[PDB]
């Protein structure tokens, strides 16, 4: 109504518009800091995959339980989600893809176990009734791989004990600065010279594969 | 009008068309006429029409006019800008940013408009 109150509303919205314009540039700076951390993790995982591929081919007498598929009715998922809000559909599009793929297993009569990273994922399963077996939250913007050891071990032990038949990781892929793609990716069911294998080649494999799955979850 | 009747094309520059509108408001107030919306003279549209309708192209020659325009309180809906815009055929917008780049004349190609 009055010309005094309208000026107060215009000033209130203008003050807000100044800080949202600043936060856009802050988000870009943090995006560049994250892109360099993605690139720094690649040279380790590609070398572990190269070693795993050679060793598994050079020693046919042994096949680790992760490299063979058991066709049974129980599955596991690692769900990656944010802790903070102000995201333009990041968690919503991810949960939509998770529910789409989970329903295929529910309809096929298969049971499901869940591992959760981030407060938004925890809130979704806490409100809708998801049976979470392991959870972690409040990790920094620059996470450390040692924080993931626990959550990944709980999910790996369940596969080694035969409780889980297949394990997947659900997260967003950086297609370009304007596009984030929600995806479900499988994990557990993965030149003519040999190494000296100082300790047992089978022992090395039992150790290298665990470091490979953890490096995939960290990436 | 004399130069137009000699068979020529003439340019008429008006320093500020807003001050012509205000001078009419001042004279109308001195004569005691009842003021209109926003306090402008009741004859606002007619006084603008009497001036602007003589500036045209005739069978002998033409008078083209370039008029500087001031917008009160940055409100394009105010009676003075709104009455003036009914008569304009083109709009040239000079830009402070374009002048900083050393580009002259400093005319904005996106904000300038023309009915032709």
């Amino acid at each position: 109504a009055g010309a005094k109150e309208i000026r107060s509303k215009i000033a209130s919205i203008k003050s807000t518009q100044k800080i949202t314009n600043a936060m856009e540039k802050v988000a870009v700076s943090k995006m560049r800091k994250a892109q360099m951390r993605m690139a720094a993790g690649r040279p380790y995982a590609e070398r572990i995959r190269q070693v795993i591929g050679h060793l598994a081919n050079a020693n046919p007498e042994y096949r680790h339980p992760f490299m063979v598929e058991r066709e049974v009715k129980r599955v596991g998922y690692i769900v990656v989600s944010s802790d903070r809000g102000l995201c333009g559909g990041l968690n919503i599009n991810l949960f939509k893809s998770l529910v789409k793929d989970m329903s295929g297993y529910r309809e096929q009569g298969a049971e499901i176990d869940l591992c959760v990273i981030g407060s938004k994922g925890a809130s979704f399963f806490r409100s809708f009734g998801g049976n979470v077996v392991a959870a972690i939250s409040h990790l920094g913007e620059e996470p450390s791989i040692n924080d993931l050891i626990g959550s990944v071990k709980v999910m790996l032990d369940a596969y080694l004990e035969g409780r889980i038949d297949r394990l997947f990781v659900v997260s967003n892929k950086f297609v370009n600065t304007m596009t984030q793609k929600p995806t479900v990716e499988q994990l557990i069911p993965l030149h003519h010279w040999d190494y000296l294998y100082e300790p047992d080649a089978k022992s090395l494999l039992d150790g290298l594969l665990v470091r490979y799955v953890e490096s995939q979850v960290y990436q | 009008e004399k130069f137009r009747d000699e068979g020529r094309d003439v340019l008429l520059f008006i320093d500020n068309i807003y001050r012509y509108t205000l001078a009419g408001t001042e004279v109308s107030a001195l004569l005691g006429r009842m003021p209109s919306a926003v306090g402008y003279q009741p004859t606002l549209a007619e006084e603008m029409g009497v001036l602007q309708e003589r500036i045209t192209s005739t069978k002998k020659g033409s008078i083209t006019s370039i008029q500087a325009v001031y917008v009160p309180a940055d409100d394009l809906t105010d009676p003075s800008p709104a009455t003036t815009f009914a008569h304009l055929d083109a709009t040239v917008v000079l830009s402070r940013d374009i002048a900083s780049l050393g580009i002259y004349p400093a005319v904005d190609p996106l904000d300038s408009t023309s009915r032709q």
Binding site: - | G49, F85, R115
Partner: protein, 73 residues
């Protein structure tokens, strides 16, 4: 019939109706009404165009367009 797909399909006008044309300046208000007059030349409907407060040059251009399209008679 105004002769426009959008108007004759979604906002039909009947004989004896009052239909308001409304909008901001310079967006086709005159164009829509003059084209409606031009489309009546073979319909049997006679037309009246009243220009109030318009520039003399604008009125002259509307009359030129009415004869170029055969609607002035």
């Amino acid at each position: 019939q105004t002769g426009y797909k959008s108007v004759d399909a979604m906002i039909p006008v009947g004989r004896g109706q009052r239909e308001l044309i409304i909008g901001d300046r310079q967006i086709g208000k005159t164009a829509l009404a003059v084209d409606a007059i031009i489309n009546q030349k073979d319909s049997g409907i006679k037309c009246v165009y009243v220009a109030i407060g318009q520039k003399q040059s604008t009125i002259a251009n509307v009359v030129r367009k009415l004869e170029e399209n055969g609607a002035l008679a």
